[PDB]
Write an enzyme that holds these catalytic residues in place. Structure first.
Site, PDB file in Angstrom:
ATOM      1  N   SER A   1     108.259 -16.787   9.447  1.00  0.00           N
ATOM      2  CA  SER A   1     108.916 -17.392   8.300  1.00  0.00           C
ATOM      3  C   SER A   1     107.865 -17.930   7.336  1.00  0.00           C
ATOM      4  O   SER A   1     106.777 -18.347   7.747  1.00  0.00           O
ATOM      5  CB  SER A   1     109.865 -18.506   8.749  1.00  0.00           C
ATOM      6  OG  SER A   1     110.392 -19.210   7.635  1.00  0.00           O
TER       7      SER A   1
ATOM      8  N   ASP B   1     122.246 -10.871  23.602  1.00  0.00           N
ATOM      9  CA  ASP B   1     121.067 -11.730  23.616  1.00  0.00           C
ATOM     10  C   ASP B   1     119.833 -10.992  23.099  1.00  0.00           C
ATOM     11  O   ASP B   1     119.192 -10.252  23.845  1.00  0.00           O
ATOM     12  CB  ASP B   1     120.827 -12.224  25.047  1.00  0.00           C
ATOM     13  CG  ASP B   1     119.632 -13.155  25.162  1.00  0.00           C
ATOM     14  OD1 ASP B   1     119.127 -13.616  24.122  1.00  0.00           O
ATOM     15  OD2 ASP B   1     119.204 -13.437  26.307  1.00  0.00           O
TER      16      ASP B   1
END
Ligand SMILES: CC(C)/N=C1\C=CC=CC\C1=N/C(C)C
Length: 330
Positions: free
Chosen positions: A199, A35
């Protein structure tokens, strides 16, 4: 040193991935959920409340000659999906794919929430976010990666998740045969303890690319792609019959519909998520309504590039003094 381990979907939908991890002496092998969105290595154990264990493999520290109680240490964590667990702590030898860390904090669960009990395939979590998020008190503990880092040939690990198939976690090296083209690296902020990056934008299907900054985290422990409501609405508007369902808890669509791809920007580079990756199957057995793999992050407080996005790429988690993230097509 290096390590290399195969990671395997827990079900036919890629709801999560499990990776075998050796703990203790002699080895006890548990299947852990790696994770990158958390920083605790915790396991179902001989200490876990009996009624809360249902099929999981447990770690029994009393059977490990190298286990040592971390005296006075406790931990308690709650995840973004509302799940939780807590307990005490041992140090022990932990190996992943041939890479060994001695004195790793192994957090033994005394209590786990229902979702963990109900998932027989996941024996615990292995956190790979920054150690600043680790919940051990009074002495915060280091992640497996942080402990291994100085010994690694290169201070990196890579995630290469498969679509409806196994993939690979590598530690300490970049497998140049595992991706196409070049790896584009992008800046990381560690201020919230995550692999947080920005992004450069998105496209829906064959549509034109929209240049826009989208902050988010690279999170192998989250199944879906969670993005701002504007972006998500633009995606689902291209799917015949798609709608946001409050009763189901997100966007759903008829699986007679064809899903467009979704492209996200990494610098000037582009990662394309095929339409098929966005299908998460019937909302209930036999239903004609399917659950979508791109969902709104509104309410979460952060955008999350979960498995849906990451499995479309070869992803480098660069743990150099100034951490960065790399993405390549594959
Ligand atoms: C992708 C997976 C974790 N989630 C689902 C998968 C399939 C069907 C229905 C719902 C659903 N999440 C809801 C509860 C928000």
């Amino acid at each position: 040193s290096t390590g290399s381990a195969t990671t395997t979907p827990i079900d036919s939908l890629d709801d999560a991935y499990i990776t075998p991890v050796q703990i203790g002496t002699p080895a006890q092998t548990l299947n852990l959920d790696f994770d990158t969105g958390s920083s605790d290595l915790w396991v179902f154990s001989s200490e876990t409340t009996a009624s809360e264990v249902d099929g999981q493999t447990i770690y029994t520290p009393s059977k490990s000659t190298t286990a040592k109680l971390l005296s006075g240490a406790t931990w308690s964590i709650s995840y973004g999906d509302g799940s939780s667990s807590s307990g005490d702590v041992y140090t022990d030898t932990v190996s992943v794919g041939g890479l060994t860390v001695t004195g790793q904090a192994v957090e033994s669960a005394k209590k786990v929430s229902s979702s963990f009990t109900e998932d027989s395939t996941i024996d615990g979590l292995l956190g790979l976010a920054f150690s600043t998020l680790n919940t051990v008190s009074p002495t915060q503990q280091k992640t497996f990666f942080d402990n291994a880092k100085a010994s690694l040939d290169s201070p990196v690990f890579t995630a290469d998740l498969g679509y409806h198939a196994p993939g690979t976690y590598n530690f300490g090296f970049i497998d140049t045969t595992a991706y196409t083209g070049s790896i584009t690296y992008t800046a990381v902020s560690t201020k919230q303890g995550f692999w947080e990056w920005t992004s450069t934008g998105y496209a829906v299907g064959s549509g034109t690319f929209k240049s826009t900054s989208i902050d988010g985290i690279a999170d192998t422990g989250t199944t879906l792609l969670y993005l701002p409501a504007t972006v998500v609405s633009a995606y689902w508007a291209q799917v015949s019959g798609a709608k946001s369902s409050s009763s189901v808890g997100g966007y759903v669509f008829p699986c007679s519909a064809t899903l467009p791809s979704f492209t996200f920007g990494v610098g000037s580079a582009r990662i394309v998520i095929p339409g098929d990756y966005i299908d998460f199957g019937p909302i209930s057995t036999g239903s004609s309504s399917c659950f979508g793999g791109i969902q709104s992050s509104a309410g979460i407080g952060i955008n999350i590039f979960g498995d849906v996005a990451l499995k479309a790429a070869f992803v480098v988690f660069n743990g150099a003094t100034t951490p960065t993230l790399g993405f390549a097509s594959k």
